[PDB]
Each structure stands twice: as C-alpha cells, then as structure tokens.
Amino acid sequence: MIKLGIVMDPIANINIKKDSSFAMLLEAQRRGYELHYMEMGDLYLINGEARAHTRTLNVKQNYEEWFSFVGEQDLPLADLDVILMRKDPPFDTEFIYATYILERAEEKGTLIVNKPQSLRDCNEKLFTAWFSDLTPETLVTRNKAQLKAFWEKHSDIILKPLDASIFRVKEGDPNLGVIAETLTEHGTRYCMAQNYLPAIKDGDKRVLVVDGEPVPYCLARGEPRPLTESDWKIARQIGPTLKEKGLIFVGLDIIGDRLTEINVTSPTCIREIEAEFPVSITGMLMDAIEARLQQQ
Amino acid sequence: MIKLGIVMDPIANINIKKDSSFAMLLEAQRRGYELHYMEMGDLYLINGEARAHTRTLNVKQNYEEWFSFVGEQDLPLADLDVILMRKDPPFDTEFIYATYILERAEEKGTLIVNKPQSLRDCNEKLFTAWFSDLTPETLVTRNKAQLKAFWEKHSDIILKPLDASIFRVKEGDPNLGVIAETLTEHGTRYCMAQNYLPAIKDGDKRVLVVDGEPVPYCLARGEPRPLTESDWKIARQIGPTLKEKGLIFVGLDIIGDRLTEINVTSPTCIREIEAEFPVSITGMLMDAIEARLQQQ
Amino acid sequence: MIKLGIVMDPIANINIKKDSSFAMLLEAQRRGYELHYMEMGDLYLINGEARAHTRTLNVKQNYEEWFSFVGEQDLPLADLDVILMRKDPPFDTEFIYATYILERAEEKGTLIVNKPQSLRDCNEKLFTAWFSDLTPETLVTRNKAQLKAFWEKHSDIILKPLDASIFRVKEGDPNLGVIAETLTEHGTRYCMAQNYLPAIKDGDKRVLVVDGEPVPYCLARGEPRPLTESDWKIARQIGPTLKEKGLIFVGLDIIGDRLTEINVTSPTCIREIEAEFPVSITGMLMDAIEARLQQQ
Amino acid sequence: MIKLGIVMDPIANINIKKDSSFAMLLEAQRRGYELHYMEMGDLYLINGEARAHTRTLNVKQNYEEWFSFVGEQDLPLADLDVILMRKDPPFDTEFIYATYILERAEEKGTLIVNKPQSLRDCNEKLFTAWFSDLTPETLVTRNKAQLKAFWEKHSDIILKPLDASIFRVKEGDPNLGVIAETLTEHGTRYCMAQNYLPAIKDGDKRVLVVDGEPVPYCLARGEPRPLTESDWKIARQIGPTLKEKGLIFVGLDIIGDRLTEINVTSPTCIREIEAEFPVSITGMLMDAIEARLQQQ
C-alpha cells in the first residue's frame, strides 16, 4: 500500500480538534496507508544514506488517546513512498539541515511534501519579493535611516522581524528608533517594513492551495468564507509557480487584495474550513499525492 | 568596462598579506574593472528590486593605506556585471537572507560568484554526503547512543559541530557523553562524527577549483605542494558538479585521500600558493568570470 | 497560624515520590500552616513594595492529584511569615532580580529561606573559595595556558563550567584545547579546573545542613549512609558560617574528604534519606523556621 | 607609594577626550601612584587566592599614544592598595563572578572602589526601590495585564528592560502588547514600567557623589550646570547610604526632581564637568581613596 511517513513536533502535545497534521493522518489512515511517525531527532544520515527511527502509527479522534505506536523500526527513508515535512517554524539552520537529509531520500525516490530545495528557496516572508505586483510596499533592510524614510513616504507602516511580533508605526509614534534598533538588533539583522493595510479589519485571510489549485473556501482571521473574486485572482497567479517548485500544500496570507505571506512549511486551518463547508481539503491533498506518485 | 561589486567583511580589518579577497580586487583592478565595495548591511530590497549602497573602491598593496573610497552611490545591483559574495562564515539565517537579495539581482542579469541557490544547497560539511565514496565514515545525528555506537565500530573518531571545534574520541576517552551532550546541546542539534584519519599528520590540504578546474598546487596545512595523483582524482570527480551548480571558486579540504569538507562561501589560501608557484589563481578566476559573462 | 509561601517551578510537573519541595509542603500542612503557592512570574514590585499573586494550596500524596488551589489572592509578601525560595538553577540575572523582590519583603518582616543577600553572596561553585583547606586544588580562569599548566602539575583534572557538564582531562587526552575553548567560550568566560579525586568511585555524597546542624545521614550518589567521621568534620566547619549567613537549609557535595560544591538554592535528597533512616529532615527544617520566627 | 590597579575594558579602544577612567589614571599618576592595568580575563583565583596578571601602566594625554606598558607581572591582588572596578555594563553573571575574585583580595586588605558586595546588592535600576519617595511610579513585572493596567492609571508611561532601549507608551499607542511581549520575552523576564516624566525635555541630569558627597556641578544630557535645590535634596538623601555601602563613586540619573537610576559600576561625565567648572572630581575621588586607606 502507500507507506507515508511524517516529520512533526511531538504528537503527544497537539490539540486534535485543531491540528491539521492530525487531520491529515486520519485521512491517510482511512485510505489504508501505513503511517510512520518521526520527530526531528529520529532522522540521521549514515554515509550519504538518509535513515530514521520510525514508529508505526495508529491515530483516532479520541481525546484521552488519539495515537498508539504499534511497531518500531530503523529503516532507510527511501523505503517510504511519501514524507510529510510538517515540522513547525522557526526556519532555522536546524530545519535547513533536516531538509538535506530529506533530499537524500528524495534522490532515492521518496516524494517529500514540500520539496526540500523549495523550502530553502522560499522563505515565508522574502518569497513575496518574487510577486511584487501582488504585495504591499515592502522594504527589507538593516538600517534605521531607510526605515524612517519609508515611514515618511507612507506615514503608517508595519515593521516585522524576518526570523507574530509586528509593530505598527503610525503618525506621531515616539518609538521608530528603538523599534528599528530592537528588530535589527542594532543594525546587524535584516527586518521588513510594509505599508499598513487598513482592510486587515475585514480579516487576515488564510487561503490554501493544493498543488497549484486553490481550495474554494478560506478562513478569515475566525470566519470561514468562500474565496472572493480577488482571492481567486491572487491564488491562481501564484499557483503554477507553487506547483512547479513542488510546493504541494501552501497557505497564503491575504489582507484585502494584497498578498502578505506564503507559508510553505506547516500550513494549517484545515479543521475550521472542513467544519463549515463541504470540502475535504485532506482528501484533496492525498489525491494530489496519489497523482504525483503514479506519475514519476 | 566590467563593473565588479564585492560583499565582504570590513575591508579596514583585513590583513593584506594574507587576504584572498584583497588579492582578487588587486587583480580586477589591474585588468581595469570598476570596483564597488559592499558590506552586508548595504544590501536591501525595495519591492522585489535588489539594491545597495556601494562605494567605488581603489585598492593598493600598502600597509598604511590599502584602500580608498572614491565615490558613493545607491544603485540597483542589476547594474553590476558581477558580484563576489566573499562574506565569511557562519552560514546562518542572515547569510541565507542575503542570498535571496543577490538572487534578485541574478534574475535581472548579474553573475554572482558563487550562485546563491547553490550556497543554500551546498553546506560545507553536509554536501560531502553527495560524494560518499570520496569521504570518511560519516554519521550526522542528534543522539548519544548512535554516536557511542559509531565509536565502538571505529574506535577512534572525530566529532565536530555542523554550525574549528573538533573533538577527538579515541580508545579509553572518559568524555564521549559530555562531548555529545555539549555538541548536540542535549539532543536538540545535529552533529557530525567521522572516523579519525591518521594521515592528517601529513597535512590537511586545501585544494582550489576554479570553475571545475583544479588549481595544480595546493597548500597543506603551511606548505605549498603540487597536487598528488589522489588530489587530481578527487578534484576532477567533484569539479563538473561544481561547475554546473555555479560554484565557480571552491576550496576542498583533503586529508590523505579523503574529502572532508567543501568551502563554497569564502575559500582562501590564494596568497600562499602564488608566492611559491608560477600560477595566478586570481587570474584564473577573473578569466573564468570573463568567460561566463561573454556567454550568457 | 503560620502563613508559609513557596516560590518554585510549576508544581504540575514535579515528581512527588522524589521532590523535596513537595515533601516540605506536606510537613508544613501537617503542622497546620496555611500554604501560598507562587511561581517566578507571580512576584512583582510596585513602588518598592514586594507583592505577589498567590494561590492558597492544598497538597496530598496522590499520583493522580497531588495539589489543589483553594483560593487566589494578590497580597503583599510582608503578610507572609516565611517564604521558601525553592526555585531551581540556573543562578542567572532573573534569579538575582527575584532575590531583590524577596529582600523587600524581608525588610518588612518575612523570613526568607534562604536569605536573598546570601544567595547572591554564595555561588554554589565559587563559595568553596572561602573554605580552601576543605576543597581540592581549584583554578578559576579564562585562559587556556593556565588550564594547560594546571594540567601539567596535576596530570588528571576535572574542568567544569561555572554557570552537570564536567570533562575529565587525564594523561594523553587530545582535547585540552578545544575543551577549554568551548568552556571559556574562547577566552570570554571563567571556567573552573580542579584535580580529579578518584574516591568519587566510593560515592559523591550529598550532606544536608539544617541551620548549621548536619543531618546525621547523607545520600552517596544512590545509597543512604550515616555521616562518616570526615563528613562530620567538614559539615561542622562550614555550619556556623551557613547559620550566620541565613543559609538555613544547605546541601554540601563531598567526594571522599573534600568539599566540592555548596548548594544554597534548591537542595534535595530529602525523600531518599527519610525512607531509610528514622530522621524527619522536613521536621528539622520546620523546627528551625519556627525557632527563627519566635526570635526576631 | 600607593599601588593602584584598575579593571577596565581595553584601554586601546577608549577615547581619551571623553573617558572618565583615563582621567582618573592621569590624576593617580600625577600624585605619583604606581598603576597596574588589568582586563577581566587577567583576574583568576588559585585555591581561594585572588591574583592577576597586571601590566605596570604609564598614561599621557596624547592622541597617538596615550599609554605604555612598562612592566608585566603576575601578583596577588592583596599586594595592591586599591582597585578601581571600572568595567562597563552589562551586569551579568560574568561580572558577578569577577566581583567574588575582587572580594577575596578585599578580605586580604585591598580597597575596592566600589565594594563588590554592594555591586551585587545595588542594581542600577532595582536599587531605586529602596528610595521610593524619590522615584517615579515604578512597576517591575513579567506580565502584560499588569503593564496594561499600569498604563490605564498613568496614560503615558516608559517601559524599559532591566538587563538604552526605552519605549514610550502614550495614549492611542497600538503597540503595548508586542512591546511587553518583546521586553518580557513572552512573560519569562522581568521588565520595568515607570510613568513618563515630561521634564526630561529640560535635561536628564547626571549627578556625581564622591563617597556620600555630591559634586556641586552635574551634566544635563550636554550642558554642565550647578546642582539645583532639588538635586542637592535628592543627592544628600541617598549619600549616607552610598557611603556606608562602600559605594565611593556614584552617578545618579535625575529627570526633574525624580531619581530614575543609580550607576554603581562605571559612572562617567567627569571630563565634561571639569572643562567648565573649577572642580577636580578625580581629585575629590583620590582624596576619598586616600582617606579610606589611612583609616582601616
């Protein structure tokens, strides 16, 4: 059958009425896939070969006991058909090292959702630089004088770190300097400034794109809604790029008609959209994995 | 003429009788290129466009004054023909962010030595996993029991961090556990174990590869020597891979006949090999840049 | 009655068959004291006055439910008769700040076990510098050459950080330099070197001293034993110093006949000695608190 | 004669037209004291004895060469008559460890300006809790809800870290939450809130107190002024406390008539007040050291 492995944060600490990874494993199990559970420290490389200690997993929607380990084994990752990298942020050097281990399994045949090269290529915040007609005014910089200047042109801006801690600097704010000194760690780290978008008050929308195809309903942060006309427009412009880069399950953050962020590591909000609308997002996902597998 | 920019650590603090970047700028200047000096904080991105504050640079082999700024300007990086990313390690998230800015200039036409995607793809220590027949026995892992076990099979090993702090664990060593707990930061970070290679006592050799072509003389750490037969063998096996990945100037670390490391960010030792042998490594480099430029 | 407060790490995560703080609260409760539970973040200072959010606590030896909160209140800490600072290490700047808040309650009348000034005065490892006839050869330093030299005089030594990660450097060890560079963080932090004491193989003993009086039975790390003649000697030399500094409950680490460490923040091993011998260490402690209270 | 040692940051990097430590050594030299220069890493403890590697120092007001080492020696610190701890902040655990080494010399007879116990006892920001009638409304806390509440009572406040990065939170500010989450590092570190004092626009004054005696002229941050009537009042209330705690050279920060901070580690502004007024602050200091020495 299909052997599906998943790399995620400790399953003993998730919340099963909210967790999207849990919802994914329930579906994989319903289709009869064999599940192999892994945490970051279970992955290792012995002379170029990617291996891991997996536990064969059984999951059930039960708040006292939602998982059971039914086997334990040390296998080559190239013995799995597909691996869901569902590790949470930050995207740090430890995450970059795990991406090289997954890439060695990938060369030997395993499908990796999402593709390790593209996880390294597509930072959630700096990747929007490749879709500049879809985003707000964005400055990435290490210095105060440029941030101050961006603030004079736009009057009301958003400063965030790259590495949610967002500061709003609007007219008359006494704090531009200390905020920029704290976020750049005194001119030694890049930070991002964008102009403030007042339509955030209508909802910061989370849109999902399953292998280039927008899921028809999104969640505005919480209210599920159909995609508006502008959500369709944005999502279909990025979608072919995400499909060809092997970004099979993607979350887009849209405030009003502007694209603000692209979650490529662990996009969530599956449970809240499936509860209101007649869509099986996890079904869409496993259908996309099954197509990718009987292809290459 | 050719407009060459360079991103490096403060030029006011290098040692000009040793610095390879300095040797590169002297050569570029001798061929009449216009030089543009940049530090990390000079790079920024305004709505997808890569820009920087550069200073037009003049360099001379003079220990009281080896550089002069002769102009200052804010330009788009796509106005440079080529940029030498010569920033020193560590390879951290700040270095990964700079690689995305350089990649936006690269899309608009600038040659980047070395290619930003490949700097992210090719970690100095984990990239040797792709040339496993050329390297020592290597385990990358987060746990103690696997390291202890690697130590039972090999008896005398080398433990290093991924992120030089190398520990040697030979028979009868009382410290395996604390070393692995310190280097893995208590099982939370990957570390590397390799078997100890006694031929390090003959020299840890630094070999240079200019766009897939080995420089005929290397430096064994310090004694310049011609490449042995085994150095030729190793360097010519990796060289086509480095050429196609846009890794135009590479340093390989070879102890005996084993490849231990691949420096892809700021390879040095130019000055020590040019002082003994009749080779102009910087000439080889600028010749390779000139070919790449009158090509694509 | 006596109102006893305790500052400790989350009571929901301790192990009640091992925790010494738990054993203390059971005793305080048996004597009918009112218990007030606090974590670090519950402590605050409003214009010089020390206050905290406490929960009135009920504890029971029950592995499903060992505590219950039976009230919640914001009070001045000067309304407590005594506070057990039982916060675990490290001893960092956050711990030093909490010590100033406890000291403001102390000035207004509360007994603080142990005294905040003395927690700042008596570092577990550097305080043994005041009992140099009782300790091994000890060097505290930032440099390699002094450590190397200490190693030439003693041949087999122990290197530890100040801030258990102990390294043993015995004859023929290849790692002196990297260990000293890692532990001093390249000459920027003090570390400690002591000569290795081979009698650690007989047990690293944990001796308890309740307001200057040694508890007659200690635990050798695990085997409970009576104090030997040399344990009596060591403990009675330090004990008057600990009583006058307000160090009411102290743990001493003794390997052979040498004093290696003085735990002044959260000394444990109560449960393991009470289980074998007919001593109530917590009874000794509450008896000492009751004396101190009907005194000053 | 008097043997004076000084522990300070690298003398090769100070600015001699501004540095107060430099001004102190020029004076000590004019009175014919022998000077012994030390950095932090020169201090060490061998079996309870405080020692250091000193260099015998010669200083001169010359911008090409303001110091010369005229001898080198390893001595016990108890061979110095007095040591100026003039190390810059932060006040961290490394600084606390150095304070224990200086205290071992102090027990053997050396005068330490300022007294090591009192450096540990008197944090620059939390020590103002002992002079609450002289300070603004001050809350030290780890939580958001208390900070928000302090902000409702006062409407315009100052938030600073304990560990200058001050934020001003006045009416209509959108950032209270992220500022408190950044400064408390998500509820894990204490921060300080004080009400904003609008008279800072008249000058944040730096007042100096030499062994309990206010220097008659202060610097308002830069304009030298005589002490006002309220500066005299504040400084003479704290001064007997500073004298008895062995805080011989102290800087007080006064905005309007409120005491905001007490610099106990490395108070400066000597050069700017001596340049305008006929006061020799360093003379006052050496006079105070000379009295302390021919006393105890």
UniProtKB/Swiss-Prot annotation, chains A, B, C, D:
Regulation of protein activity: Inhibited by 7,8-dihydrofolate, methotrexate and trimethoprim.
PROSITE patterns: ATP_GRASP
Domain of life of the native organism: Bacteria
Keyword annotations from UniProtKB, A to Z: ATP-binding, Glutathione biosynthesis, Ligase, Magnesium, Manganese, Metal-binding, Nucleotide-binding
GO biological process, one term: protein homotetramerization
Known outcome of mutating residue 191 to A: No loss of activity
Residue ranges annotated for the ATP-grasp domain, each copy included: 125-290
Effect of substituting residue 122 to A: No loss of activity
Cross-referenced Gene3D superfamilies: 3.40.50.20, ATP-grasp fold, A domain, ATP-grasp fold, B domain
Mutagenesis or variant effect for residue 218 to A: No loss of activity
An example molecular function term from Gene Ontology annotations: ATP binding
Keyword Ligase found: yes
Subunit relationships: Homotetramer.
Protein's name in the database: Glutathione synthetase
